[PDB]
C-alpha cells in the first residue's frame, strides 16, 4: 500500500485474530530489527548463512512467552535430544523448552546457541503437517531485498601479520563489499525455505510490506537534527513491487475513506478526551469536531499515520475562528 | 648543527607573559557566575540547561512504552504520574497589583549588562522549590488526576471491587 | 541526546518572551505534546500555554487598548495581574518541560549535556567530555572516560 497507511494495523489485528482462536502465531514485531539491526553474525552451525542475535534471541524469547500455552503441548518431532545443556538445563522434549533453551543462557554462550536453535526451531515448524501455523512478519519487503550488513573485507579472514607489508587497504579506505541478501539470513531462510518448498498447506503467511523510508524528493542535503522526523526511519530509497519481489498475494490496503476515517477520528479525539489526554477543562478554546475533522482531512489526505501526527497538531492551529465567533454569538443571546 | 652550549640571544630576550584572565581582555578571574547550576533546587537544576527534544528520542521512547505496557512494569510510570500531579496544578491567580520586580531604571545604563544579570539572579532565587504562586503537595485537592496509583487503569481488576 | 557540549542557561521569562520564535515554535510544542501524550501524562499545561501564545500571536499586530485616564487604575492593575499570571502559567510549563525530559532520558538512558541533573540517575550535575580539568561547579577533577550513570546493557 501507500507509505504510512494502515499497513501494520492490519497485521497486529491479524495476530489478535489468530491468537484469539489460539492457533500458533509467529510474529516479527519489527522485521527492521533483522535486516537492519545492531549487528550481524555468521551462523556457527550453518555455513554461509548469517544470524542477527539482537532480534533472534528476542524472537526466541517472545515465541516462548507468546505461544507458551500451545508450545508446551507441542511435542518436538525431529531434533537431537542431545543439545549441549548447561549445568542445570533440562532436555527439550517440547519445542517450548527448545526456545527456552536458547534465550535462557548467559551470553556470549547464547549467541552460538541461538544460531543452533533458529536452525532447529523451524525444523519442527516445517515438519508439522496437521497443526495450523500462521507466520506473520511486519516488513517482508526487507526480507526479499539486500541488507545493509555488508560482507567483511576478505583481509579479516587472513589474520594479517603487519600493516606496511600487509598489502591491505582495510585501514586506509573503507570500500563497499556487496550487501548481504536477507535470504542468506538463516532465520529468513527458515521462512524463505518454507515459501518455495511445496506440500506445506499448514504454514500461512500474512505479511506486510512496510514503507517507512527516508523520503527523498530529488535533493536532500543534511537533515536538521534539531528537528528531524526520520532519524529513526529506515533508509532504503528502493522502489518495491510485491508482485515481482514476493510470492504472497497482494492485498492493497489504502488510506481511510471518509466513512472509516470519520469513526476513527471520532474515537481518536473523543475517547482521548474521556481518558483526560485531551483538552479537558479548556475544551471550549479548541474547535468542535466537524472543523477538527474537516481540517485534518485536508492536511492528512485521510492517511491514518498522518492523521495521528496531524491530530497531535490540533495544538498549534493558529487560524481557527469558530469558538471566538461562537462565544461572541452566545454573549449576544445572553 | 651542534646546538651551541649557551644560546646568545634566544633566551636573552624580554620575558613573555601568560594570560591570567579566564575570559575577555584576559581579566575575568574565576568567580561563581550567574550560570552556576543549583542541582539541589528541585528535580531539575536551576537554572535549567538547554534541552533539545529531537524526534530520535520520541520514536525511541515510543518503543520503550512497548515494553512497560506488556511487561507490566508499570512502576516506572508511577513515578511520572505522581511527578506530574504535583507539578501541574492550576497556578493560582496572582492578587491585584502584584508583579515580578523588573530592573530598576536609572541604576545603570540601558546597554550595561547589569540589566540581564539582575533578572537572572532574581530568577535564581525563585527556584521551583520556592514557587509558592503554584499550589502542590498533599493538601491540594487534585480534581483532575486520580489520587491513588491503582486508580490508574492498569489495575482495573482491583478497581473492580 | 546528541548534544553534549557545555551550555548556557537563560532565565524562564527571557525564553518565554520569544514567543512563537522559539518558545511557542509550532513544531516544538508539538514535540513536547506527543512526548506528554505518549507518557500517559495529561498535556494540561501545554494546552494551557498553547492558547496563551495562540491568542498573543494572533493579536500581536493590534494596538494596546486606548489608555484613557483612569484614576482608579484598576484597568492598569488588571493589565498587570493578568499578565504576571500568564508568565506564571508559562513559568510552570517551562519548568515542566525540563522536568519530564531529563527524567525521560532516565528511561531511555540518554546522557544529557554538561551541568545537567536527572532526578535519580544523576543526582548532581553530570559532566563528561568537557573542555576543562574539573566539574565546572563542583571542582571535582573529571574521571576519564566520561563517567556513566546507567547500566551497560540496553
Amino acid at each position: 500500500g501507500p507509505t504510512g497507511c494502515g499497513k501494520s494495523a492490519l497485521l497486529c489485528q491479524a495476530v489478535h485474530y489468530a491468537r484469539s482462536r489460539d492457533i500458533i502465531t509467529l510474529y516479527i514485531a519489527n522485521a527492521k530489527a533483522w535486516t537492519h539491526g545492531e549487528w550481524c553474525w555468521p551462523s556457527t552451525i550453518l555455513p554461509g548463512f548469517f544470524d542477527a542475535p539482537d532480534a533472534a534471541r528476542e524472537f526466541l524469547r517472545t515465541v516462548a512467552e507468546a505461544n507458551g500455552s500451545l508450545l508446551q503441548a507441542w511435542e518436538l518431532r525431529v531434533t537431537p535430544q542431545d543439545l549441549p545443556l548447561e549445568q542445570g538445563e533440562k532436555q527439550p522434549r517440547s519445542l517450548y523448552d527448545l526456545c527456552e533453551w536458547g534465550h535462557r543462557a548467559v551470553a556470549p554462550a547464547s549467541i552460538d546457541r541461538q544460531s543452533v536453535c533458529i536452525k532447529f526451531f523451524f525444523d519442527e515448524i516445517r515438519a508439522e503437517k496437521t497443526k495450523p501455523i500462521i507466520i506473520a512478519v511486519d516488513g517482508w519487503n526487507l526480507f526479499s531485498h539486500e541488507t545493509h550488513f555488508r560482507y567483511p573485507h576478505p583481509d579479516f579472514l587472513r589474520t594479517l601479520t603487519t600493516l606496511n607489508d600487509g598489502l591491505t587497504d582495510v585501514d586506509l579506505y573503507p570500500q563497499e563489499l556487496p550487501r548481504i541478501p536477507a535470504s542468506r539470513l538463516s532465520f529468513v531462510r527458515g521462512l524463505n525455505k518454507l515459501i518455495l518448498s511445496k506440500q506445506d498447506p499448514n504454514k500461512f503467511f500474512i505479511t506486510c510490506t512496510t514503507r517507512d523510508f527516508k523520503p527523498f524528493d530529488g535533493v536532500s542535503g543534511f537533515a536538521d537534527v534539531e528537528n528531524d522526523r526520520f532519524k529513526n526511519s529506515l533508509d532504503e530509497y528502493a522502489p518495491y513491487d510485491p508482485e515481482k519481489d514476493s510470492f504472497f498475494h497482494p492485498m492493497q490496503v489504502e488510506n481511510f475513506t471518509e466513512y472509516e476515517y470519520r469513526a476513527f477520528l471520532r474515537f481518536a479525539i473523543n475517547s482521548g478526551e474521556l481518558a483526560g489526554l485531551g483538552w479537558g477543562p479548556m475544551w471550549h478554546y479548541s474547535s468542535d469536531f466537524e472543523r477538527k475533522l474537516y481540517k485534518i482531512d485536508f492536511m492528512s489526505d485521510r492517511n491514518p499515520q498522518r492523521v495521528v501526527d496531524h491530530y497531535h497538531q490540533e495544538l498549534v492551529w493558529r487560524y481557527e475562528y469558530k469558538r471566538t465567533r461562537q462565544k461572541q454569538y452566545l454573549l449576544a443571546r445572553r | 648543527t651542534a646546538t651551541p652550549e649557551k644560546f646568545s640571544i634566544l633566551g636573552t630576550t624580554h620575558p613573555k607573559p601568560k594570560r591570567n584572565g579566564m575570559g575577555r581582555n584576559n581579566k575575568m578571574r574565576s568567580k561563581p557566575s550567574d550560570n552556576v547550576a543549583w542541582y539541589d533546587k528541585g528535580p531539575v537544576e536551576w537554572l535549567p540547561r538547554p534541552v533539545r527534544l529531537t524526534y530520535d528520542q520520541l520514536d525511541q521512547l515510543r518503543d520503550w512504552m512497548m515494553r512497560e505496557t506488556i511487561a507490566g512494569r508499570t512502576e516506572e510510570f508511577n513515578k511520572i504520574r505522581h511527578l506530574h500531579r504535583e507539578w501541574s496544578q492550576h497556578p493560582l491567580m496572582p492578587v491585584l497589583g502584584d508583579v515580578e520586580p523588573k530592573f530598576p531604571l536609572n541604576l545603570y545604563k540601558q546597554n550595561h549588562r547589569a540589566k540581564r544579570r539582575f533578572l537572572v539572579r532574581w530568577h535564581k532565587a525563585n527556584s521551583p522549590t520556592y514557587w509558592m504562586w503554584m499550589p502542590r503537595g498533599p493538601a491540594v485537592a487534585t480534581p483532575l488526576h486520580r489520587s491513588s496509583p491503582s486508580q490508574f487503569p492498569e489495575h482495573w481488576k482491583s478497581l473492580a471491587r | 541526546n546528541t548534544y553534549l557540549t557545555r551550555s548556557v542557561a537563560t532565565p524562564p521569562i527571557s525564553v518565554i518572551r520569544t514567543g512563537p520564535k522559539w518558545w511557542a515554535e509550532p513544531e516544538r510544542m508539538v514535540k513536547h505534546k506527543v512526548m506528554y501524550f505518549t507518557m500517559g501524562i495529561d498535556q494540561l499545561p501545554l494546552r494551557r500555554t498553547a492558547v496563551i501564545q495562540k491568542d498573543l500571536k494572533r493579536f500581536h499586530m493590534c494596538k494596546p487598548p486606548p489608555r484613557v485616564g483612569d484614576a482608579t487604575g484598576y484597568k492598569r492593575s488588571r493589565g498587570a495581574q493578568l499578565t504576571t499570571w500568564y508568565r506564571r502559567i508559562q513559568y510552570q510549563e517551562y519548568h515542566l518541560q525540563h522536568l519530564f525530559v531529563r527524567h525521560m532520558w532516565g528511561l531511555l538512558r540518554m546522557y544529557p549535556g554538561n551541568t545537567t541533573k536527572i532526578q535519580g540517575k544523576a543526582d548532581d550535575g553530570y559532566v563528561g567530555y568537557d573542555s576543562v580539568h574539573f566539574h565546572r561547579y563542583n571542582r571535582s577533577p573529571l574521571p576519564f572516560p566520561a563517567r556513566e550513570i546507567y547500566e551497560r546493557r540496553k
Binding site: - | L92, P94, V95, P101, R121, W122, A125 | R48, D55, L82
Partner: peptide, 23 residues
C-alpha cells in the same frame, strides 16, 4: 485582550522570595 479566562482562587501577596541582589 484577556484570553484563557479562568476562575481559580487568588494567590497570596508576595508569593515569591525576593531576588539575590537589590538596592
Amino acid at each position: 485582550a484577556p484570553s484563557y479566562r479562568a476562575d481559580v482562587e487568588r494567590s497570596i501577596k508576595k508569593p515569591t522570595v525576593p531576588g539575590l541582589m537589590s538596592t
